[PDB]
Amino acid sequence: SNAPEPDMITIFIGTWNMGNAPPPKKITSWFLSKGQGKTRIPHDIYVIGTQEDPLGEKEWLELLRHSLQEVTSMTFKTVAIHTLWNIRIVVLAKPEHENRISHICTDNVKTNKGAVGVSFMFNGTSLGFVNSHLTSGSEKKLRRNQNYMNILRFLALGDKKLSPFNITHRFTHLFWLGDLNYRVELPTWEAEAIIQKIKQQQYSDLLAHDQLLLERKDQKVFLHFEEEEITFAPTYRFERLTRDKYAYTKQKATGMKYNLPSWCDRVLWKSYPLVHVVCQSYGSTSDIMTSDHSPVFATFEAGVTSQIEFLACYATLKTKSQTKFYLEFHSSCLESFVKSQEGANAAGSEGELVVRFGLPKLKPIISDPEYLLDQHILISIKSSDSDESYGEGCIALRLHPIYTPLTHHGEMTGHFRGEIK
């Protein structure tokens, strides 16, 4: 008898800045999650992002497929490969999944730096993957933040019918990896102390100065993304062919400069509310030494799948606009997206607008509760004057009151609250 489709899959994410050098003949440690770092069987999907990648596409594919044969005893199939400059993403999957995978998309954004991405459906679940190489230099964190903002706005992945939504709402699970280039922000006179803290494996004191964690805390990038705790050493910048020494100085015509050891190479994720996702490993290798960066691995278990009445809903927006607003509801469980009538505007606290709705009844294509309880509704609040979104969010149907933050262009713009039946 036909077995039920999987309710969970496992996903390997790798990111490696290859430093423009060919890889060594053995890279299996990367796929085995062998190295320092948090931990909680071949994976269903392998996503391999490289930067400063010097190889051709078919050359690198054959090295990966052979390495995975040795690790898993299976021959993985190519789902997608996409390259911009020397920034590349490869997605491989078990052969048994080939008929489960549909709507494969690829795209890139130039910001040489930039991003590549791949998205596809696994049965009923959308998955997105972004590999970005962001602006380099300890002093350029604001430019990295802007690179992130431009990638999220302009990378075209996922269902194009989801017109008001960027990649941060288009997927049940979105994974963002790469050489994000954020540095440990400490004075250069502290270099030798940092090296000592690394040898003592005292990472929490250095992570207090990691620009990516600090910019996330201030809501400047990666809003509502998670990252596993980091318990591996900084992955940059090593002398090549060893891992025993960091190369933290750099000669320049204008005098010696510094690249203090940093966690440049990262994996983050954002999943729809109430969907299962758990990180099983996050770490770096120590035996792959052809680059001045070490490869990073992160593995995950992720949940997948095979009338709706919105009641007493209001939005709060930080805006001075006096337009009226309406709502748009989008979901794979609807035959097409649904627009509401205009709400009623009132002032809230300073600079804020409350938009109250006293809303169309949504009719899902399938009414089976085993189907519906796993669905989500994407919500956009749009200006009637311009038809542009002022805020996007997501509600789980897994049953009540409902709530989502609203963002636009990846930054907070307000909140949406109500009840659902």
Structural notes for this entry:
The structure is a monomer. It contains seven helices and 23 strands. It has 421 residues and is mainly β. The protein has two domains: 1-306, 4-Layer Sandwich (Deoxyribonuclease I, Chain A); 307-421, no CATH class. The strands form five sheets. The protein has a seven-stranded mixed β-sheet, covered by helices on one side. It has a five-stranded mixed β-sheet with strand order 6-7-8-9-12, covered by helices on one side. Strand 4 (77-84) and strand 5 form a beta hairpin. The chain starts with 7 loop residues before the first strand and ends with a strand. This is Phosphatidylinositol 3,4,5-trisphosphate 5-phosphatase 1. It is found in: Cytoplasm; Cell membrane; Membrane raft; Cytoplasm, Cytoskeleton. Belongs to the inositol 1,4,5-trisphosphate 5-phosphatase family.
- Computed structural class: mainly beta
Secondary-structure element string: EHEEHEEEEEHEHHHEEEEEEEEEEHEEEE
The radius of gyration over CA amounts to 23 Å
Share of helix among residues? 10-25%
- Identify the CATH class of the largest domain: Alpha Beta
Strand content: 35-45%
CATH topology of the largest domain: Deoxyribonuclease I, Chain A
Q: Name the strands of the widest sheet in spatial order.
A: 2-13-14-1-3-5-4
Main sheet properties: 7 strands, mixed
Contiguous helical run count: 7
For the termini, the CA-CA separation is: 36 Å
CATH homologous superfamily of the largest domain, by name? Endonuclease/exonuclease/phosphatase
- The gross shape turns out to be globular
The CATH level-2 architecture of the largest domain is identified as 4-Layer Sandwich
Number of domains: 2
Count of β-strands: 23
Subcellular location: Cytoplasm; Cell membrane; Membrane raft; Cytoplasm, Cytoskeleton
Family: Belongs to the inositol 1,4,5-trisphosphate 5-phosphatase family.
Protein name: Phosphatidylinositol 3,4,5-trisphosphate 5-phosphatase 1
